[PDB]
Amino acid sequence: AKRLTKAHWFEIQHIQPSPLQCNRAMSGINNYTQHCKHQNTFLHDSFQNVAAVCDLLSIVCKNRRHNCHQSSKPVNMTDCRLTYPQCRYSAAAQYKFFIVACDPPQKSDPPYKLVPVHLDSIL
């Protein structure tokens, strides 16, 4: 999409409601960046459900900001690890809590109060 909001890029990178193979799912991401990303975590939940985490209590992020929010329960995920543009990955299923950073929406985002913009942590 030539240009993207932070939240839209978050969705592209990290929202995968139905699992895909890592090699296929990473192809689009690696095309936008022109490199084989070495690792990526895909969350198997909808954008709407991940965005609801932003309404939960705010907590500190790795970068020392306080716009992070922890999921109330674990979710299923796929961890893709690089093993260009012929990038090949290994995959691991995971079931973990996550922490997202959230910001107010940009003009081009859905008009929630807050939207998820970064995957801060898995735990």
Side-chain angles (χ1 to χ4, degrees), residues 13-14 26 29-30 35-40 82 87 89:
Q13 285 212 115
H14 298 299
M26 292 301 299
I29 294 168
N30 293 337
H35 90 313
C36 296
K37 196 181 181 194
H38 294 195
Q39 187 277 340
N40 189 59
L82 184 66
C87 312
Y89 293 85

Side-chain angles (χ1 to χ4, degrees), residues 18-23 25-31 33 35-62:
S18 287
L20 300 177
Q21 290 288 282
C22 284
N23 288 347
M26 292 301 299
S27 174
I29 294 168
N30 293 337
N31 185 73
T33 60
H35 90 313
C36 296
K37 196 181 181 194
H38 294 195
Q39 187 277 340
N40 189 59
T41 302
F42 290 108
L43 306 175
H44 301 312
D45 204 355
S46 65
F47 181 84
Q48 297 71 29
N49 286 347
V50 172
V53 176
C54 299
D55 295 327
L56 303 180
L57 290 172
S58 65
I59 59 175
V60 73
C61 307
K62 284 179 168 146

Side-chain angles (χ1 to χ4, degrees), residues 73-80 82-85 87-90:
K73 303 191 181 177
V75 301
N76 294 282
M77 313 172 171
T78 294
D79 166 58
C80 300
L82 184 66
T83 56
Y84 172 92
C87 312
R88 295 192 68 81
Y89 293 85
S90 65

Side-chain angles (χ1 to χ4, degrees), residues 79-80 82-85 87-120:
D79 166 58
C80 300
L82 184 66
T83 56
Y84 172 92
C87 312
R88 295 192 68 81
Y89 293 85
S90 65
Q94 301 283 275
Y95 181 67
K96 293 291 176 66
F97 293 84
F98 63 88
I99 297 170
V100 282
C102 305
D103 287 335
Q106 296 173 257
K107 292 293 188 302
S108 297
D109 283 323
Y112 294 101
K113 173 181 314 291
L114 294 168
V115 290
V117 293
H118 299 297
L119 180 61
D120 165 90

